[PDB]
Structure 1
Amino acid sequence: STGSATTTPIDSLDDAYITPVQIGTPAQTLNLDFDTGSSDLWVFSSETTASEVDGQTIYTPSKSTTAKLLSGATWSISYGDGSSSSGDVYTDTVSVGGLTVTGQAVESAKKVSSSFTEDSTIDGLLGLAFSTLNTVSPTQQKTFFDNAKASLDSPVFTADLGYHAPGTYNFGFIDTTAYTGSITYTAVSTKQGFWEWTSTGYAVGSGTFKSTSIDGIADTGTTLLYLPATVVSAYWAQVSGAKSSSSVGGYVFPCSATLPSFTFGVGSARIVIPGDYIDFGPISTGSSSCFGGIQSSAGIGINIFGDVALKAAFVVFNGATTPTLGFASK
């Protein structure tokens, strides 16, 4: 089997991407944030505290003839940005772009933190990291990909995120028309439950390539590119007027600036992030200070190749017995 779904930026800055997902019988379509940095499929629901729902589409398990309460199961997750959600669990039929999984754990939110409430466009998350990170207790549950994997033509999914434009998530096949040149594959460590890999280095603009190992995770659920402070300082030093602002919470730059590209290494291959991918616009409405898309990972504990990096590539998440990651230019 295969599946193919379009993923769409939630706003003009590409803060996140949403993908329609069919849950239950008859189908209830919710727009979920596909997140390769977490492993829970959770949704706004009829069980979510009323005051914490503001415009989201909800899943109502009582209206689904295939929903079954997963007796005694609860979940609770806190993300790297401090956001959180928790609730109980149903199993139900879940379809993505024509690919169907029966008995998928659908985690129903009873509580969500304010940032989720405030994002009217995101109806929940669909985790695509390794199932060892799934928070359901007392019986850990599998991700959608994990459940689908054996049925897929090939045990892979791909992320093809657009810049200020829609893109595609494919399951079970590699669309050879969706990228240029070749796909370069690189080793993955699953020890922390992430799609963790090691970049071979970087360049800033037309500068020389610096060979240096950068361990990080491929994370579709994080907006920005978080890298070591040395690397990030080298990037912003090429932008006149750029500075790290403690009050704003990262590097900012004059909105009048032209940003240089940023290149990262995948083995001997190179992925070039165009300068305008690194512009996240005025820090507040009307400001001439703009927020940078490359930020320090120093206060995180891990480097994160988020959407800023991934959207510059066609990315293969290979879930073979020994998982690997593939990157191609596009």
Structure 2
Amino acid sequence: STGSATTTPIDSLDDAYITPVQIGTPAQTLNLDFDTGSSDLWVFSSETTASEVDGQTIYTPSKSTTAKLLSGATWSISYGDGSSSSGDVYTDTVSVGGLTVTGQAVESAKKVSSSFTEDSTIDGLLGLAFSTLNTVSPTQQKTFFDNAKASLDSPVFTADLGYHAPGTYNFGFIDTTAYTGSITYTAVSTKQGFWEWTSTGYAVGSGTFKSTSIDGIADTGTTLLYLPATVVSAYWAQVSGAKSSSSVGGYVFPCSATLPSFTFGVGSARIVIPGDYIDFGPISTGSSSCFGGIQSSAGIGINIFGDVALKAAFVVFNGATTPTLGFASK
């Protein structure tokens, strides 16, 4: 089998992407944030604290004939950005882009943090990291991909995120029309539950390529590109007036600037992030200080190839027995 679904930016900055997901019988369609950096499929629901719901579409398991309480199971998750959610668990039929899994753990939120409440466009998350990170207790649950894997034509999914435009998540096949040149595959470590890999280096603008190993995670659920402070400083040094602001929370630059591109290595291949992709616009409405899309990972504890990087590429998440990551230009 295969599945194919369009993913759409939630706003004019590509702060995140939502993908429609069918849950239950009859189908209840919720717009979920597909997140290769976590492993829980959780939704706003009829169980969510009323004051913590503000415009989201909810899953109501009592209206689904295929929903079953997973008795005794609870979940609780905190994300790298300080947000969190928790609740209980149902199993139900879940379909993405025509690909159906029966008996998927659908984690029903009883509580969500303010960041989720405040984002009316995201109805929940669909995790696509390794199932070892799933937070369901006392019986850990599998991701949608893990459950679908055996039935897929090939044990893969691909992310093709757009810049200020819709893109595509495919499950079970590689669309050879969706990229240019060849796909370069690179090793993955699953030791921390992430799609963790090692970039071979970087370049700033038209500058020379610096060969250096940068371990990090391919994370569709993180907006920006987080790299070692040395790398990030080298980038922003090429932008007149750019500086790290403790008050704002990272590198800012004059909105009048033209940003240089940033290149990262994948084996002997190169992925070029155009300068425009690195612009996250005014820090507040009407400001002439703009927020940068490349930020330091210092104090995160891990480098993160988030949407800023991934959207510059066609990305293959290869879930074969020995997993790998593939990157192509597009």
Shorter-chain TM-score: which interval? over 0.9
Structure 1, unmatched stretches of 5+, are none
CA drift of 1:156 comes to: 0.0
Secondary structure (helix, strand or coil) at the match of 2:148 reads helix
**1:167-194 per-position Cα deviation (integer Å, ceiling 9, x unaligned):** 0000000000000000000000000000
For this pair of structures, how many residues does the alignment match? 330
Question: Take 1:326 and 1:150, find their aligned partners in 2: how far apart are those partners?
Answer: 20
Alpha-carbon distance in 2 for matches of 1:80, 1:271 = 25
SS where residue 190 of structure 1 aligns? coil
**Partner Cα separation in structure 2 for residue 81 and residue 171 of structure 1:** 28
Whole-Å separation in 2 of the counterparts to 1:83 and 1:312: 27
RMSD of equivalent CA atoms: 0.1
Once the 2 structures are TM-superposed, how far is the Cα of residue 82 of structure 1 from its aligned partner? Answer: 0.5
Mapped to 1, the partners of 2:240 and 2:312 lie a distance apart of 24
Partner deviation per Cα, 1:293-329 (whole Å, 9 max, x = no partner): 0000001000000000000000000000000000000
Aligned to 1:220: 220
Q: Secondary structure at the match of 1:230?
A: helix
| CA deviation after TM superposition for structure 1 residue 125, in Å | 0.0
Deviation sequence 1:95-120 (CA, Å, 0-9, x none): 00000000000000000000000000
Structure 2 residue aligned with 1:273: 273
Aligned-pair CA distance for 1:23: 0.0
- Identity between Structure 1 and Structure 2 (%): 100
**Per-residue deviation, residues 34-81 of structure 1 (Å, max 9, x unmatched):** 000000000000000000000000000000000000000000000000
**Deviation digits for residues 122-181 of structure 1 (CA, Å, limit 9, x no counterpart):** 000000000000000000000000000000000000000000000000000000000000
- The separation in 2 between residues aligned to 1:116 and 1:251, in whole angstroms, is 25
Structure 2, unmatched stretches of 5+, are none
Q: What SS does the aligned partner of 1:22 have?
A: strand
Structure 1 outlier segments of 4+, above 3 Å: none
CA distance in 2, matches of 1:94, 1:158: 19
**Separation in structure 2 between the aligned mates of residue 150 and residue 277 of structure 1, nearest angstrom:** 36
Q: Distance in 2 between matches of 1:272 and 1:80?
A: 26
Q: Name the structure 2 match of 1:322.
A: 322
d(CA) in 2 for partners of 1:93 and 1:124? 16
Distance (Å, rounded) in 2 between the aligned partners of 1:299 and 1:59 = 36
CA distance in 2, matches of 1:258, 1:81: 28
Q: Distance in 1 between matches of 2:299 and 2:322?
A: 31
Partner of 1:32: 32
Q: Secondary structure at the match of 1:177?
A: coil
Instruction: Give matches, 1:1-330, under 5 Å.
Output: 1-330=1-330
Partners of 1:79 and 1:282 in 2: CA distance = 25
Inter-partner Cα distance in structure 2 for 1:248 and 1:79: 20
Q: Distance in 2 between matches of 1:135 and 1:237?
A: 41
Q: Give a deviation string over 1:1-43, Cα, whole Å, max 9, x none.
A: 0000000000000000000000000000000000000000000
TM-score by length of 2: 1.00
Rounded Cα–Cα distance in structure 1 between residues aligned with 2:286 and 2:100: 45
Q: How big is each residue's C-alpha offset from its partner over 1:276-300, in whole Å with a ceiling of 9 and x where there is no partner?
A: 0000000000000000000000010
CA distance, structure 2, for counterparts of residue 299 and residue 99 of structure 1:
39
Measured in 1, the distance between the counterparts of 2:149 and 2:239 equals: 45
Distance in 1 between the 2:172 and 2:91 partners?
23
CA–CA separation in structure 1 for the residues paired with 2:255 and 2:183: 35
Q: If the length of structure 1 is used for normalisation, what is the TM-score?
A: 1.00
| 1-structure distance, mates of 2:209, 2:39 | 34
